[PDB]
Design a protein around this nucleic acid. Structure first.
Ligand SMILES: [Mg+2]
Ligand SMILES: [Mg+2]
Ligand SMILES: [Mg+2]
Ligand SMILES: [Mg+2]
Ligand SMILES: [Mg+2]
Lengths: 292, 126, 208
RNA sequence: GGACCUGGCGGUGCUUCAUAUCCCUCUAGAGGAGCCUGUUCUGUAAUCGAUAAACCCCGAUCAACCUCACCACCUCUUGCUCAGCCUAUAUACCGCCAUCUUAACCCUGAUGAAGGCUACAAAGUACGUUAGGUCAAGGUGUAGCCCAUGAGGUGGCAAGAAAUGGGCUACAUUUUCUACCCCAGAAAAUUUAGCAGUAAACUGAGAGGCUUAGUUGAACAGGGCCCUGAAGCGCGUCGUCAAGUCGUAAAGUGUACUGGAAAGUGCACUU
């Protein structure tokens, strides 16, 4: 057990050590920070142990010792909080606030906070049923016409998960010296890497490493693979393609070129067509590779 | 006792198992022999064995924990952790004696770095 | 699998996406909106949006494959189709005016009908109990019977009694035989239908 | 003698589902021929046994007149060098692999044995082990024989037969050879995986049967369990001759008659 005097001595020791470390590293003690402490301790006491916690560390004592033992009453013995005798003053105070806001509203993507992190915020252990109670109250608050204050209150208890599918980065439309518009893109399949330039206007000529596509790809399967992107969006014979492919084999190179042409052609089609190509599997890098 | 009736302080090195040697523990000896391309790893191992036995027999009941044997160039540093039970005069005597024996036995400048502690620094209880 | 469970199979149909928003049901509309969120797998080498694509012929080619040699399997398939086309043109040019209206020259129609004529309706499944495997008649699923027609055709064409007759010519002849309800594959279908009627004692076990 | 309580069955079955491994189905390949090994029988005095120890100088290989090993006869002796043997022992240790084991507090029952849950909440809170393998990429010892467990010489030994287990080669027309790297011309039953860049086919790099880098690229993808998981119901609460030195896993209560009585029927009652 750590007495408050012990923690006080630890704080003053840590401050003296902070100024000492600033002295050793030549930095200004006034602006010396915790990240600087971490970097300096890493330099002066190098350690390659895989366990991140096992390395030498200099933390502020409150970070090290468990300081959740906050006193809930003063010298006279009167508890500070009017819900102290419930034993769950934080949780029930929060429930009281939520109920009051629901009363006020009655008179007038993202995920819910988990149980353990809710305990961490409240600094109080709570069961599952009371967590469910709180979440149902939060749902009720959301369904009602919650205002800006209520919206941010809910956001205090709503964690963030990012969803960013549907959005294919559309490469910029560049212009060559002759004034013609084109777009460049890259693709990869197994060890084959392709880089294609699709022109806005053309007559359907594909040129692979400076060779016509039927001469570079004798097999019909690869020519069908090259045809698939333009055929899908009904623009066969309307663009010129100049691509450079390297590595891999016959089918891997054909697949890399197909991916590159689809990603470059996304510049000259409508957003609905881009989404359709995405759903047809034409804009996804195939990750299947030889396993050791 | 009875057959179904069946059905110790430890320091950090004692507590943690061998599969933590590069995760939580470290290496007691530090030298270049085991690196790729370097030679004489076995000779360093034999030297380490002799150092450990010699030190454990020359400081009996004093070493609180295991030695740390560092090597830089031809230097040989023994960083030991001992107890505050033996008198400092005897510690100085033994430091001088051990330094000179090991320097003349290994033909290198050996040096020794006692760190006394009041008692064994127990990590946990197993 | 290198794909996460999140990734979904792609839909290569080209006329599905052009379906006007008006014809969309609320359910189909919801599915269309849901696919917007999902991750989709890269389309595999093989099926494309081409109008000459035929999944049945692709599966037949894959079933003739040996050692990953797809070029050779497709070469054999196209040689077989060409041979069927040429034989039907030969028969059509030598036929009377009234026999020409009933000579099929499309090799794809012939291939599909020949495989359809070889599909069995009933098969046998062994079941284990008592140490004795029991052979119960079973109505075959559509996938199983479509697979069995192809497997029987390919095994019939791989028979070693056909010495130095090249696979395209054997396969075209077998396909044209099956198109007319003749040949050994139709007989193999009949000998399973008879060996499933010979064992109607256990005909009602519905839990194979 | 009356009332009450704890229980315990190292218990017994079933029910439903999660039921993944494991199934079963389903998919794709794996039997003939020639040699080499395992076991058995038969046979010999005997070993169709081995080459840091022959041969060969494409690979491998059989017996080789090599040599060791075996069988039948002999010889040598202080000799090699205070000689000589790879003969034993890790059933000596070390090393290297592997096996197995690893309390308090608060309430209720009148302060009895005793009991304490309801969430729209009603008292509950806190290392050893091993007759182990390895004496080929390694050691430290200990024992053995020393007219022989050493050194030689003369002959022989060189097996036979089945049924099955395993291994190595070739096994083609979707093939083979050339040019090319794919539009040419000439020739002729168990078992192993499955679950995808996987199976199958084909190339390169290494340390010198094992480690890494590539190319092409499939088929099938349905029903139920063992077993833990999730719970629920029920049941169940042995006998005997002298104790084991014994054996074994609609229903009732009365009464009357009963001569086809392992209990039945008749009459009256109870739930
Ligand atoms: Mg022999
Ligand atoms: Mg010898
Ligand atoms: Mg042993
Ligand atoms: Mg009677
Ligand atoms: Mg009676």
């Amino acid at each position: 057990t750590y007495t408050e005097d012990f923690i006080k001595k630890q704080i003053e020791e840590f401050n003296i050590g902070k100024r000492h470390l600033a002295n050793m590293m030549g930095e200004d003690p006034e602006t010396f920070t915790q990240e600087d402490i971490d970097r300096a301790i890493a330099y002066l006491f190098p350690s390659g142990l895989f366990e991140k916690r096992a390395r030498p560390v200099m933390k502020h004592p409150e970070q090290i010792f468990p300081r959740q033992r906050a006193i809930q009453w003063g010298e006279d013995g009167r508890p500070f909080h009017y819900l102290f005798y419930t034993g769950k003053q934080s949780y029930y105070s929060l429930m009281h606030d939520v109920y009051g806001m629901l009363l006020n509203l009655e008179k007038h993507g993202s995920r819910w906070l988990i149980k353990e992190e809710l305990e961490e915020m409240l600094v109080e252990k709570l069961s599952d049923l009371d967590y469910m109670q709180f979440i149902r109250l939060l749902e009720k608050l959301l369904t009602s016409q919650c205002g800006a204050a209520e919206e941010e209150f809910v956001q205090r208890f709503r964690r963030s998960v990012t969803l960013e599918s549907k959005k294919q980065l559309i490469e910029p439309v560049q212009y060559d010296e002759q004034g013609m518009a084109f777009s460049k893109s890259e693709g990869k399949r197994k060890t084959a890497k392709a880089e294609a330039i699709v022109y806005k206007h053309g007559s359907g000529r594909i040129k692979v490493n400076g060779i016509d596509y039927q001469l570079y790809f004798p097999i019909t399967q690869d020519r069908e693979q090259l045809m698939f992107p333009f055929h899908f969006v009904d623009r066969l014979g309307k663009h010129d393609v100049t691509c450079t492919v390297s590595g891999g084999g016959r089918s891997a190179q054909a697949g890399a070129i197909r991916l590159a042409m689809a990603k470059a052609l996304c510049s000259f089609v409508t957003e609905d067509e881009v989404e359709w190509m995405r759903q047809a599997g034409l804009l996804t890098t195939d990750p299947r590779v030889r396993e050791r | 006792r009875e057959l179904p009736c069946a059905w110790k302080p430890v320091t950090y090195e004692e507590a943690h198992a061998p599969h933590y040697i590069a995760h939580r523990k470290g290496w007691l000896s530090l030298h270049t022999g085991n690196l790729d391309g370097e030679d004489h790893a076995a000779e360093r191992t034999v030297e380490d064995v002799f150092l450990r036995k010699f030190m454990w027999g020359t400081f009996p009941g004093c070493l609180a924990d295991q030695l740390v044997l560092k090597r830089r160039g031809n230097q040989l540093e023994i960083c030991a952790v001992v107890l505050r039970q033996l008198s400092p005069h005897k510690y100085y005597f033994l430091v001088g004696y051990s330094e000179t024996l090991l320097s003349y036995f290994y033909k290198c400048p050996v040096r020794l770095h006692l760190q006394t502690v009041p008692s064994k620094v127990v990590y946990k209880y197993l | 699998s290198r794909y996460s469970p999140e990734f979904k199979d792609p839909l290569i149909d080209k006329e599905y996406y052009r379906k006007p928003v008006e014809e969309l049901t609320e359910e189909e509309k919801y599915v269309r909106e849901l696919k917007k969120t999902q991750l989709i797998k890269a389309a595999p080498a093989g099926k494309t949006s081409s109008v000459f694509e035929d999944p049945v012929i692709s599966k037949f080619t894959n079933m003739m494959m040996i050692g990953g040699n797809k070029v050779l399997a497709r070469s054999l398939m196209i040689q077989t189709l060409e041979a069927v086309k040429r034989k039907q043109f030969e028969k059509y040019h030598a036929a009377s005016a009234e026999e020409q209206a009933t000579i099929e020259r499309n090799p794809y129609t012939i291939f599909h009908q020949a495989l359809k004529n070889c599909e069995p309706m009933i098969g046998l499944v062994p079941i284990l109990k008592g140490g004795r495997f029991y052979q119960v008649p079973v109505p075959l699923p559509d996938r199983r019977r479509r697979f069995l027609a192809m497997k029987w055709m390919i095994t019939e064409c791989r028979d070693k009694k056909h010495q130095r007759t090249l696979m395209p010519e054997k396969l075209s002849h077998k396909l044209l035989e099956a198109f007319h309800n003749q040949g050994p594959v139709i007989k193999r279908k009949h000998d399973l239908h008879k060996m499933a009627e010979a064992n109607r004692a256990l005909a009602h076990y519905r839990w194979w």
